[PDB]
Amino acid sequence: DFTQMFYNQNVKQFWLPEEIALNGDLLTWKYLGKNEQDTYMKVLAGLTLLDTEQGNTGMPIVAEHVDGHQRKAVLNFMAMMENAVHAKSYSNIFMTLAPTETINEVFEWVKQNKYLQKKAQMIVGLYKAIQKDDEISLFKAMVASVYLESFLFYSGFYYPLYFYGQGKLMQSGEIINLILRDEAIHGVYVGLLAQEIYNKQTEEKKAELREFAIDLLNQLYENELEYTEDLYDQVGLSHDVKKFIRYNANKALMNLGFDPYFEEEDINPIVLNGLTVEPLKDDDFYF
Amino acid sequence: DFTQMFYNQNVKQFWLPEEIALNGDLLTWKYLGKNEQDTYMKVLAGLTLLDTEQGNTGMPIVAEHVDGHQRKAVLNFMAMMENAVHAKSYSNIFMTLAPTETINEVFEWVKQNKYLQKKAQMIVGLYKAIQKDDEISLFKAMVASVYLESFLFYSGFYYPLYFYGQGKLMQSGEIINLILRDEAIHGVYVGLLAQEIYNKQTEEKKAELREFAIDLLNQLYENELEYTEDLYDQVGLSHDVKKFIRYNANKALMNLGFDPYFEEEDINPIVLNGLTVEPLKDDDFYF
Amino acid sequence: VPKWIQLNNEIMIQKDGKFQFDKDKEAVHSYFVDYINQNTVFFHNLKEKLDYLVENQYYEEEFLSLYSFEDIKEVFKTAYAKKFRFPSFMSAFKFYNDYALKTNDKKKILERYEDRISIVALFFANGDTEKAKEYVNLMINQEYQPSTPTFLNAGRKRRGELVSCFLLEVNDSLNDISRAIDISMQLSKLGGGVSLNLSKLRAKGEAIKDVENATKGVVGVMKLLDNAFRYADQMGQRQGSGAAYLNIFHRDINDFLDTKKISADEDVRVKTLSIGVVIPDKFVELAREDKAAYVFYPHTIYKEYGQHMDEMDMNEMYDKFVDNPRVKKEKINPRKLLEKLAMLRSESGYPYIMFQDNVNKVHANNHISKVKFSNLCSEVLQASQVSSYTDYDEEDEIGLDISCNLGSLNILNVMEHKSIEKTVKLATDSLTHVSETTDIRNAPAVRRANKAMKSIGLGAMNLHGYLAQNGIAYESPEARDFANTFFMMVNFYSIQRSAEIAKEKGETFDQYEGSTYATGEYFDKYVSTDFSPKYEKIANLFEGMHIPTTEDWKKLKAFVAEHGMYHSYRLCIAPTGSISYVQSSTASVMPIMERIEERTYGNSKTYYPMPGLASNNWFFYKEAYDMDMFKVVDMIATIQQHIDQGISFTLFLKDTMTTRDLNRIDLYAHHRGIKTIYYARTK
Amino acid sequence: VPKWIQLNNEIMIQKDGKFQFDKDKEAVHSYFVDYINQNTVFFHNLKEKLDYLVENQYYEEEFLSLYSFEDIKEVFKTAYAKKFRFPSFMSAFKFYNDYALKTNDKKKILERYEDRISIVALFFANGDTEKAKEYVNLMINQEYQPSTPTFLNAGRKRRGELVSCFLLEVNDSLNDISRAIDISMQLSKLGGGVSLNLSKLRAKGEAIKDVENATKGVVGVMKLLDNAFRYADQMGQRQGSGAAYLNIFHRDINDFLDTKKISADEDVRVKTLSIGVVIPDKFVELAREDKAAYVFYPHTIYKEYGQHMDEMDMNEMYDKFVDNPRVKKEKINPRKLLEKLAMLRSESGYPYIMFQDNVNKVHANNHISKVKFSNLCSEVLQASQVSSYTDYDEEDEIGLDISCNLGSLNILNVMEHKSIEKTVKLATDSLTHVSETTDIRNAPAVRRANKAMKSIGLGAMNLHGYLAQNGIAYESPEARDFANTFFMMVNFYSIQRSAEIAKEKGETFDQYEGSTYATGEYFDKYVSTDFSPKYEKIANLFEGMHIPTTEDWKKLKAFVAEHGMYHSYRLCIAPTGSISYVQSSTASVMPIMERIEERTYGNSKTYYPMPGLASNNWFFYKEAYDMDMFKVVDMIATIQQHIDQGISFTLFLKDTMTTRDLNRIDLYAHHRGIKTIYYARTK
Numbered sequence A, B: 001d002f003t004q005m006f007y008n009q010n011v012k013q014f015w016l017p018e019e020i021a022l023n024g025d026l027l028t029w030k031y032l033g034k035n036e037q038d039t040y041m042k043v044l045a046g047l048t049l050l051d052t053e054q055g056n057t058g059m060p061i062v063a064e065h066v067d068g069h070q071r072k073a074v075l076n077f078m079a080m081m082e083n084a085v086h087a088k089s090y091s092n093i094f095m096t097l098a099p100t101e102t103i104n105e106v107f108e109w110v111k112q113n114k115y116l117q118k119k120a121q122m123i124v125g126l127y128k129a130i131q132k133d134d135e136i137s138l139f140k141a142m143v144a145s146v147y148l149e150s151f152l153f154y155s156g157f158y159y160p161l162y163f164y165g166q167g168k169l170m171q172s173g174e175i176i177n178l179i180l181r182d183e184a185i186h187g188v189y190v191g192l193l194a195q196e197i198y199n200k201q202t203e204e205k206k207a208e209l210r211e212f213a214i215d216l217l218n219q220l221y222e223n224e225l226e227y228t229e230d231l232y233d234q235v236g237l238s239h240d241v242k243k244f245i246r247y248n249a250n251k252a253l254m255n256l257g258f259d260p261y262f263e264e265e266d267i268n269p270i271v272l273n274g275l276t277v278e279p280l281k282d283d284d285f286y287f
Numbered sequence C, D: 001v002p003k004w005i006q007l008n009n010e011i012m013i014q015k016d017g018k019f020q021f022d023k024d025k026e027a028v029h030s031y032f033v034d035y036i037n038q039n040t041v042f043f044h045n046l047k048e049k050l051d052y053l054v055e056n057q058y059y060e061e062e063f064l065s066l067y068s069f070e071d072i073k074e075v076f077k078t079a080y081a082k083k084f085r086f087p088s089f090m091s092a093f094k095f096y097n098d099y100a101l102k103t104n105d106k107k108k109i110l111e112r113y114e115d116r117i118s119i120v121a122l123f124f125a126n127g128d129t130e131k132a133k134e135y136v137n138l139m140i141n142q143e144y145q146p147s148t149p150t151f152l153n154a155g156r157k158r159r160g161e162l163v164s165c166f167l168l169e170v171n172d173s174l175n176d177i178s179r180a181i182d183i184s185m186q187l188s189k190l191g192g193g194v195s196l197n198l199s200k201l202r203a204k205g206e207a208i209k210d211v212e213n214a215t216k217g218v219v220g221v222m223k224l225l226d227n228a229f230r231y232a233d234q235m236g237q238r239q240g241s242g243a244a245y246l247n248i249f250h251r252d253i254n255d256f257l258d259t260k261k262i263s264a265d266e267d268v269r270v271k272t273l274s275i276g277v278v279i280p281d282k283f284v285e286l287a288r289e290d291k292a293a294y295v296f297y298p299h300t301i302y303k304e305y306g307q308h309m310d311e312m313d314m315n316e317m318y319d320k321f322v323d324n325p326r327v328k329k330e331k332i333n334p335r336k337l338l339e340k341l342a343m344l345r346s347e348s349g350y351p352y353i354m355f356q357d358n359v360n361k362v363h364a365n366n367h368i369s370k371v372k373f374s375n376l377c378s379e380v381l382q383a384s385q386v387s388s389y390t391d392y393d394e395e396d397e398i399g400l401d402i403s404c405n406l407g408s409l410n411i412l413n414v415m416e417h418k419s420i421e422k423t424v425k426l427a428t429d430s431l432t433h434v435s436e437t438t439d440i441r442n443a444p445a446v447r448r449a450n451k452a453m454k455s456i457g458l459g460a461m462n463l464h465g466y467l468a469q470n471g472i473a474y475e476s477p478e479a480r481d482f483a484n485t486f487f488m489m490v491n492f493y494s495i496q497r498s499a500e501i502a503k504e505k506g507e508t509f510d511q512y513e514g515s516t517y518a519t520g521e522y523f524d525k526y527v528s529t530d531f532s533p534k535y536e537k538i539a540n541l542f543e544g545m546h547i548p549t550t551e552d553w554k555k556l557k558a559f560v561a562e563h564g565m566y567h568s569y570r571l572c573i574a575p576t577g578s579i580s581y582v583q584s585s586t587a588s589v590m591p592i593m594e595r596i597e598e599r600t601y602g603n604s605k606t607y608y609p610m611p612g613l614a615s616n617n618w619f620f621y622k623e624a625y626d627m628d629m630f631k632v633v634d635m636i637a638t639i640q641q642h643i644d645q646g647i648s649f650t651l652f653l654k655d656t657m658t659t660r661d662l663n664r665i666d667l668y669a670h671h672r673g674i675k676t677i678y679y680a681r682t683k
């Protein structure tokens, strides 16, 4: 009942980072403190890693196991967006704002950062555990994918949105909003596929799947807290970002058909502000 | 040396089925004989069936085994074009020209056809034989992929190009020309990835891979001749189609860095109308 | 966020269900009181300010020295006597961010609006203090607006050329192509838009010195021109702008159009070069009959006949070219070419369309030459003669290259003051002065044609603003009636001023004797037809103004026959892009694009309601995209019957309009006498 | 497959473990008998052939009109009397595919080798029958090979210029840049390669008319020039090739070098323009000491001192520029720049390296000017003076451009015939005639410099071939001894011929009196040092030939002081690529790249063994990539000490070599007096 409308929405949202000129951010970037620039680079690098694996591994593997040519076409399109559009856009931003050495250093930093490695290990592990014709392993990977789309990106998205909302780094911010617009529909779509599998189960099996989903969310959440503190303490925003990731965790659960898990909190209002051809006939020559 | 350049060329060639209005083809379709309509339907179904294998297996399997983030992104983009753009385009052409019952029957016929099946299963067999961390099996699959993209499609493309060059079925011919333009670049790109593997091999292993490629080409070519007579004798075109197959076989070989196999022939003019850094050590300055 | 920006942003905050249009007066008041009065360099008196400006290489002392300081003081007092106030924030913002003179460090404002107007008036008067005061009254009343080049640069030492529109003919030779590249770079360096005619260049695959398939066609020359315009970017603040025009019957027409396709290869794409196509009536006739057409190789025609293809009448020579074996041609589908043009205009808005027969059936100077192409804005339509740039040490055969300095009447202010005649004559005098003071040192044909033709362009602006502020729909018959009467009067008074100038100076423009002005064929419709308003509502708008009759036109015809005409061209309606904000007027004679214009400057966004926009006249400020393009074509054709040059005519298309709708709009424009079509803008 | 091609392919088929070298003679004989004789037009007599060629617009009738037909017949008999036979298939194939005159349809052969030789000799003799016979004997004996332009075009009506190498100075102005583009296009239209000096252009971010940051730098001009060369690609028969040179101290050096990075953006990347770098000894000294270096903005230096940066002595003015606050400069790392040059040459072979102080420490015409850049082949090193091209209707200040017509001595044939003196003098006469008959009417500086300086380039080829066929290793000290003696003799006889021409014509080259020839400083090393062979084996090679001694050099010095010199520059060893096959010789003085050359012509692959290659001389035909580049540098430095211009020096690198090895080779070449390095070829 939904794939065709998602197909149409995905293809109509198609974009390339080159559509957005980035030289306009040069001055507002120059004006940020060293702490702010450091957090910003690292945040986008963490996002780049997530999209790299979502494009290389997550979306293609889910596409392989989901039945139906139209469902596969949507998932293939989403995969392309992840690595050919999203992951690449971050390099466009980096190449504009930062010198090569700072770019090299931040990519080295992703490799050695323990929270980023842990979250990649956990998510990719679940993708690679999918067994052919085994719907339960597929469900588990789809939960992981929804958590990546609708929860894990948000510790990263906070900062570009926070600046966009203050009228700073608005070209980079425009790119990020386009990425976010895509991930929102990706999270909903994968969520609907996960619910399909969940709804086939006995009540006993469903109870276990909810346990899996909640245990996984909590494990990812605890790691994300440490990641958030590590990045944001130097810019004074860790508590604010934490509220934002809890907000988005609830959205991820909802995408999976589950009740919200965290209590509602006031999000920084700045971040909220951050959000044919037809032929000519003979009569056409007479009036 | 080449992936970013191909990335650029691929994304700038992006297109969607909806861009070409198809209904005006009915004004020339109605004037074709039964044999012409039959051949066109059968050719179209042949292309559709082969392209589906490439979208579901060929491109995604190569993307899976190739190392490199940028290569995986380009390959993902190509897989997207197969599944999201090409497949929808072929379906659109069919739905415009034939009623539902006729489409189902043509696909039943072509699905049972000996020459279409022989080539489809030969290609798919090589994709299924790729082994993790074995570059020889990957190379063999890449050869199969290049043969599909740059050679096997062309016994089929001939007919739409033949009409397109005569002013018949111009809307569907425009679509086919866009598809063909994508397959050409797909073949060239996968060809470069195959040459990379080939160049890492010993001289004996190279000679062995050359023998594999020529042997495979021979098997496919002999079946193409039979496929060609089966479809084109009823419309009197087989001689010219055979010249077009050999010409495209030579292009496929050149994509794989190999010499042409067949002598140069002229093509039907109607179809043509359709178509190591180290630092100085303070002693290098003294002699 | 500055206070004035906060007040301006309150425009869109609807109160009581209606926009707070009164916030713009508050916005402009706060803008002034908090930014402009603070950041204005203070001088004790006019003498000290003028001495500082002249000493610091701001004002040229040549024009100021012609007046005794008492005269300059009187002119400046006249400018300030009006107590002119900008009615909206956007007008003052535009003036003080683009035209107001600022110190070399761009931190302080040396010129107010009155100072700029007084300097421009002194430059125009050329020593005439009373003439300078008349110019000051004309500009301070905002009845006449000098073009952006003249207005910004007049009286400035650093100033660039006061003329900004240049048309160059390119001859079919390497020497001529190199000279064209050089002249294009030289003129772009001056900041003027340069338009080139590529119809004389031989097509791709033609022979050079009995060597076949050697020529690269017009696309290689276009790549050269694109690189030249990219290099001469005018400091980069305004990227170099050039237009290339090609006849539709040129062989390279398909390749010429393919340079603007997004799918085009990068080695063929021309990023910085606008393209216009010249369409003779023969092509439209061929497409209408669905007949197969031919595109000709220009050099074969030139060899067979000793004249260029674009120098001949295609309506008379097409059959001879087709039947001549020595002429090389390839078959095309005229309807397919029209559809391709519509598709390209939808995708990118290109090419500009020039209807050659529409232009030349009313052209007064066909004896000098026919109009073969247009400018970068598509409204300049003048006779041109190609130059023969020979080898070094060989004398060049300098032809005529087109150029005109622009000015715009403010229709609303001209009608409110009932000063059509006086405003038109003063604008003609100022344009003539600008033309006489121009001397291009690296464009021999441009300079020669400026001396010989004395062509000026007097446009108009605020047509839609005036109509909406008077309860008249743009598409209504009354709007066309007013436009007809007003532009007939403008043409009458510009012709009268040109004849008077010719009588006073004793000279006409070169080759005036063979023009339709001299033979009287120009005045046939004016002496035979009455152009007074046919509606009482429109006739009332002209109350207090004398509308010329057939007897007045007969008298003017006799006067011209006696004394001749000083200008070969007088009237052209240019887009008038950024100077319309200063005048608080709608752009040119086009309908408004938006009722409220939302723009982002810096990191703060600003809102610009259309001048005079209010609840009462909200419905009369209909947007162009919501308008029937056939009625817009009708209005432009009504105006065009009184404009001797062209009119920049942008097509405003909805996204739902197919290529057939665009083709029908172009065909109706050609049918209605439209000379050029500028842009295809899609909502 | 052709029978001759099958015979040639039998070369590689090993028989008894040995290459079948005798199969090439059979291959050439079969090629002739089966294709050349069949496709050779038949003429009853020479008179009929000459009439047919003249009437059919194949030959220029003017030069043939200076001889009675009896003399033309005698010259043709002299050419044919030799019964010259091509020793290999590739020689005849190259001649009859590139230089042999063919009918307008390129179907039949109108000229044989003898016919082309006779026509060239008659063109050279300029009406002298005995001189024409001497030229015929020289060319048919293959002792002298005129450059490809002269050999191909001499005596042909539809011919390009006989000079094919031009060097253009570009002044820092828009007029000069546009004129440079025009001249480059005009010269490429003639088929000649154009090298442009961009060191006088101001760097990116410089002020244009007291407006800062307005300049695009040398990269924008580079894009302009690249597009100009692509457009004027010789009617598509040969893509337009140009070279741009920038001094290493120019601020745009890094941007200039980045245009050749593969990863470079297409906007900045230049595709068809070769780039060379001029490195003064100051840069090498700075890099050696690892001291921080500065790159200067040329316009600031010009304003501060009134001279261009490349017109001043960098070794003396570098500290003054660094200490001058009014001179803008950018800190750089000289060793990082050297390593960047090495890596760029490894990846692409660019840039060319010109060691400015090596060129000018021996430059004989420093009074006219220093040598600032080289040509597209990096062997032309002459004084140039920049022209000042002004606005239209102003007078241009025409300077001195660079152009020399080339010819190559066949070292093996000259040594076998013991005719160094006669061959050198005849080649000098022919090059002087080519220079005299050359007149470019669209490059005023080129024409003026050709008339004033009378520069010629007499090169040599078959050095490695001659040495290998005589059992001498290219890297051996004996090879360097032979090169020293041979090129000393060549220089001696070219100087003697230049002095004799000056005496006969009673005229020297412009500003000869200030040259080192006039003051005698040129002959210091020749009058103080002996260059006779130090090895008995090499001394035997010169048996029957007089080796000039110190007394001979003193007599020549006195003769030059009495009579002067006709040529400002005489000797330059150009790459001489295409005509090496016809001459059956190794290209230039470089070592062979491969013992047997595998080429593809159509679908047929041809095998070309190195001329004279055999089993007994296989070891002496060592490939260049296997040689020590230090020994090749030693050889080139031994040769370069007797060449007034440069030697086109290609570096042959193995893929295992790092950038450090390339840098060491460059530094050793600079140490050894090398003037230019042409290409970094990697295997």
Ligand SMILES: Nc1ncnc2c1ncn2[C@@H]1O[C@H](COP(=O)(O)OP(=O)(O)OP(=O)(O)O)[C@@H](O)[C@H]1O
Pocket: C028, C029, C032, C033, C037, C083, C084, C085, C086, C087, C092
């Ligand atoms: N809308 C405006 N357009 C142009 N200039 C303005 C505008 N508003 C203010 N100014 C300038 O700022 C000065 C101060 O404005 P303000 O309205 O406070 O003046 P005022 O003392 O009330 O009297 P007056 O209007 O006669 O100047 C004005 O004299 C004029 O110089």
Ligand SMILES: Cc1cn([C@H]2C[C@H](O)[C@@H](COP(=O)(O)OP(=O)(O)OP(=O)(O)O)O2)c(=O)[nH]c1=O
Pocket: C171, C172, C173, C174, C175, C177, C201, C202, C207, C208, C209, C210, C214, C215, C216, C217, C220, D189, D231, D232, D233, D234, D235
């Ligand atoms: C020289 C040259 C010219 N052209 C084009 C540009 C000109 O419009 C056209 C004519 O060149 P011309 O400069 O006029 O050449 P020509 O006059 O000597 O030869 P002909 O009399 O036969 O014309 O050729 C190229 O495309 N490439 C080139 O390299």
Ligand SMILES: Cc1cn([C@H]2C[C@H](O)[C@@H](COP(=O)(O)OP(=O)(O)OP(=O)(O)O)O2)c(=O)[nH]c1=O
Pocket: C189, C231, C232, C233, C234, C235, D171, D172, D173, D174, D175, D177, D201, D202, D207, D208, D209, D210, D214, D215, D216, D217, D220
């Ligand atoms: C006009 C122009 C010049 N230039 C560069 C190229 C020239 O080498 C350099 C000087 O241009 P010039 O033509 O010499 O300008 P100018 O002489 O009027 O200014 P100045 O007195 O400072 O010399 O500026 C650009 O890069 N872009 C341009 O648009």
Ligand SMILES: [Mg+2]
Pocket: C172, C173
């Ligand atoms: Mg010509």
Ligand SMILES: [Mg+2]
Pocket: D172, D173, D174
């Ligand atoms: Mg200058």
Ligand SMILES: [Mn+2]
Pocket: A051, A054, A081, A082, A086, A087, A179, A182, A183
């Ligand atoms: Mn993503």
Ligand SMILES: [Mn+2]
Pocket: A054, A078, A082, A149, A182, A183, A186, A187
């Ligand atoms: Mn996603």
Ligand SMILES: [Mn+2]
Pocket: B051, B054, B081, B082, B086, B179, B183
């Ligand atoms: Mn496909």
Ligand SMILES: [Mn+2]
Pocket: B054, B082, B149, B182, B183, B186
């Ligand atoms: Mn494909």
